[PDB]
Amino acid sequence: VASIKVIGIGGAGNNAVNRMIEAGVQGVEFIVANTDAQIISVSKSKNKIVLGKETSKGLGAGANPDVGRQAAIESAEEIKDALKGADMVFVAAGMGGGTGTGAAPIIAKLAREQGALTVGIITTPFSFEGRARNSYAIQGTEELRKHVDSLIIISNDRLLEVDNILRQGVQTITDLIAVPSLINLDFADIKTVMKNKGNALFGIGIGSGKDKAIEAANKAIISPLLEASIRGARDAIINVTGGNTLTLNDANDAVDIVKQAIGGEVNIIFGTAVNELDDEMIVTVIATG
Amino acid sequence: VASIKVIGIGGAGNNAVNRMIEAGVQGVEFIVANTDAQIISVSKSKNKIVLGKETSKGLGAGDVGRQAAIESAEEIKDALKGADMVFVAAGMGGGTGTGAAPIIAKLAREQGALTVGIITTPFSFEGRARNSYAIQGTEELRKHVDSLIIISNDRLLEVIGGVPLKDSFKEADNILRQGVQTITDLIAVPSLINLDFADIKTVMKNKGNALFGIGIGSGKDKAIEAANKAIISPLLEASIRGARDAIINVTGGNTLTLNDANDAVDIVKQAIGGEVNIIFGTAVNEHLDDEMIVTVIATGF
Numbered sequence: 210v211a212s213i214k215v216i217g218i219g220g221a222g223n224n225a226v227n228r229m230i231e232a233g234v235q236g237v238e239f240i241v242a243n244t245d246a247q248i249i250s251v252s253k254s255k256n257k258i259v260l261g262k263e264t265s266k267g268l269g270a271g272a273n274p275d276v277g278r279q280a281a282i283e284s285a286e287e288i289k290d291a292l293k294g295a296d297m298v299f300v301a302a303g304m305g306g307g308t309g310t311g312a313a314p315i316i317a318k319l320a321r322e323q324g325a326l327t328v329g330i331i332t333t334p335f336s337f338e339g340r341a342r343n344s345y346a347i348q349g350t351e352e353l354r355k356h357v358d359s360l361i362i363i364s365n366d367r368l369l370e371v372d373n374i375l376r377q378g379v380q381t382i383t384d385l386i387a388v389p390s391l392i393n394l395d396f397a398d399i400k401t402v403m404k405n406k407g408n409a410l411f412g413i414g415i416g417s418g419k420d421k422a423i424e425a426a427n428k429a430i431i432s433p434l435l436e437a438s439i440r441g442a443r444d445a446i447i448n449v450t451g452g453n454t455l456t457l458n459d460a461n462d463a464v465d466i467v468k469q470a471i472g473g474e475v476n477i478i479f480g481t482a483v484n485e486l487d488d489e490m491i492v493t494v495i496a497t498g
Numbered sequence: 499v500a501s502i503k504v505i506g507i508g509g510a511g512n513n514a515v516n517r518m519i520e521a522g523v524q525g526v527e528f529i530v531a532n533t534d535a536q537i538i539s540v541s542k543s544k545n546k547i548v549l550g551k552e553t554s555k556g557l558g559a560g561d562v563g564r565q566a567a568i569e570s571a572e573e574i575k576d577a578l579k580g581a582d583m584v585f586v587a588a589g590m591g592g593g594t595g596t597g598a599a600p601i602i603a604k605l606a607r608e609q610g611a612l613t614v615g616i617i618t619t620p621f622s623f624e625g626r627a628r629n630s631y632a633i634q635g636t637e638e639l640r641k642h643v644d645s646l647i648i649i650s651n652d653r654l655l656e657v658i659g660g661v662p663l664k665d666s667f668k669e670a671d672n673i674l675r676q677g678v679q680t681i682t683d684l685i686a687v688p689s690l691i692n693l694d695f696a697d698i699k700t701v702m703k704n705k706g707n708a709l710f711g712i713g714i715g716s717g718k719d720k721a722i723e724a725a726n727k728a729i730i731s732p733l734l735e736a737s738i739r740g741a742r743d744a745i746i747n748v749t750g751g752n753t754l755t756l757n758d759a760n761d762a763v764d765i766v767k768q769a770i771g772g773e774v775n776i777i778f779g780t781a782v783n784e785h786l787d788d789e790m791i792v793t794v795i796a797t798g799f
């Protein structure tokens with residue numbers, strides 16, 4: 210009977226081990242390690258390691274992998290004790306943060322020096338987690354690869370299939386000023402909606418096929434980006450973006466849905482813009498006050 | 499014709515401006531500012547600013563963002579001069595964006611621009627310190643803009659993934675489970691067809707990158723469907739063509755036939771080609787109804 214251990218490192222690895230326990234994976238001992246003692250406390254695993262207990266003190270490592278690496282080096286002997294006797298160790302972690310990125314290679318090294326067949330299985334971050342977290346993941350992937358027998362890499366980008374966020378907020382307003390279309394707004398109109406207004410609200414929604422206007426305008430008004438708060442606003446800008454075949458009536462039908470949701474006496478400017486859309490119509494809103 | 503400028507600050511802001519330039523956004527001047535001289539150089543923006551080249555000396559900020567921006571005030575004023583509207587784009591929580599954005603917004607608004615902040619705030623998995631640094635940065639930026647559009651990265655994840663935050667990584671958690679269980683069921687859970695640990699060791703010891711694919715199929719041709727989906731699975735980093743060893747796990751319900759399992763193994767063998775050393779086993783999963791799942795781990799390139 211082979212002795213098999215899975216050690217999940219950092220938050221992603223801790224949640225993956227939770228999923229394995231919950232799905233009844235048999236034949237395996239589970240261990241979780243983290244610099245954050247909070248995640249560790251709600252773990253379903255009965256083998257719990259707080260990394261860097263004397264230095265990070267269970268408070269978490271933050272963003273820098275160097276802290277997670279130093280944390281695991283400090284806990285080397287307790288990691289060896291938990292893994293002792295394994296024929297095979299899986300090191301599970303999400304690349305991109307301070308703990309999994311930096312601690313996973315140290316734990317793999319200790320498992321393999323103990324004599325275990327050591328397999329890393331990791332994720333890499335969404336591109337829209339940004340360059341710092343993706344760059345860290347690249348470096349941690351290579352360091353882990355040095356210390357595992359085999360390395361399995363699962364891309365969160367690809368797992369998607371099976372962001373333009375800041376771009377879309379900007380274009381929402383600027384296409385209506387600088388790119389002539391069916392309906393546009395003067396710069397002075399934007400300025401009155403947005404001068405000295407404080408917090409503004411962004412929503413978005415898309416709708417394919419006929420009556421795509423009703424569908425897209427309804428998704429926009431309850432977009433999670435709005436956080437369920439659109440009604441009452443004193444002013445609001447509405448962008449209706451679509452393809453070549455975009456009737457001014459479809460635009461008016463979309464804006465109608467939203468004027469109802471806003472309220473009474475709401476200054477609602479709006480306009481259009483054409484994009485590269487098979488009956489697919491996108492509605493964005495920004496509302497203030 | 500109004501003069502509109504976007505100034506992207508730090509990594510998230512530099513990223514945003516690249517996306518706008520690549521998408522061909524029209525009628526807007528773009529500017530990028532970062533303490534990191536390297537990320538700037540690669541940028542596709544005509545107007546570049548290395549913030550605080552004396553304080554940071556071209557090294558990223560990791561309070562350092564704010565000081566870098568103050569020291570660069572002249573270059574910021576000069577790039578923004580003449581704007582009717584300035585979008586100050588940044589991701590809150592980092593070392594550059596969080597400190598620099600409110601200074602850049604202050605300069606832009608004192609020059610006379612309608613100044614709109616548009617910012618992300620962090621994923622909760624980025625941690626409490628990151629998230630509290632972002633809140634400070636947000637409340638400081640809000641003092642110096644006309645209006646502030648705030649995009650929570652947690653909500654962006656829901657919008658992109660289509661799933662509540664609690665379940666945003668359920669599928670990734672589940673794939674990591676299946677990667678493990680692909681092997682461990684075959685070693686440790688008794689079935690018609692198990693594998694010896696020594697033979698797993700042959701496939702996986704001192705190998706480097708192991709490719710992983712999964713596919714599910716149903717109905718009459720479920721084996722053809724499941725196996726082919728596994729060998730062109732988007733999870734695969736590269737083609738399995740040419741691998742020197744592979745483990746195949748065939749999992750099914752109580753109606754799965756020897757022929758079904760044999761067809762799936764044969765499909766993977768032909769797709770890899772050559773003299774690949776293939777080992778395989780089976781597992782039962784009774785939650786499956788006229789379905790089978792094929793997973794492959796290939797090594798050796």
Ligand SMILES: Nc1nc2c(ncn2[C@@H]2O[C@H](COP(=O)(O)OP(=O)(O)O)[C@@H](O)[C@H]2O)c(=O)[nH]1
Nearest residue numbers: 219220221224303305306307308309667670671
């Ligand atoms: N599978 C899984 N991946 C996650 C989860 N949360 C975040 N991630 C991904 O894993 C990466 C690392 O996050 P985390 O493990 O929480 O970082 P750390 O604990 O600070 O090292 C993130 O960049 C996300 O891409 C999760 O709950 N499950």
Ligand SMILES: Nc1nc2c(ncn2[C@@H]2O[C@H](COP(=O)(O)OP(=O)(O)O)[C@@H](O)[C@H]2O)c(=O)[nH]1
Nearest residue numbers: 337339508509510513589591592593594595620
């Ligand atoms: N949605 C999105 N968020 C990002 C992106 N890049 C960074 N962020 C967020 O912005 C925060 C600051 O990251 P970053 O700008 O690279 O740090 P800085 O350059 O040192 O200020 C990160 O914690 C992420 O939450 C991106 O491309 N898309």
